[PDB]
């Protein structure tokens, strides 16, 4: 493995691989 930028959908794709789609919540920003 190597460290890389993962913005937006790319972060969710990595949580998907790390957790196995089990139940993550990334705390997306609520501000307008």
């Amino acid at each position: 493995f190597v460290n890389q930028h993962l913005c937006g959908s790319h972060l969710v794709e990595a949580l998907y691989l790390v957790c196995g789609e089990r139940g993550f919540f990334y705390t997306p920003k609520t501000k307008r």
Binding site: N3, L6, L11, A14, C19, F24, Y26
Partner: peptide
């Protein structure tokens, strides 16, 4: 939070494991 940190800088699997349940 990881959703901004991994956009603005390089990410890690150790840091992402905090958000899984």
């Amino acid at each position: 939070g990881i959703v901004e940190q991994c956009c603005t800088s390089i990410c890690s699997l150790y840091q992402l494991e905090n958000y899984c349940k």
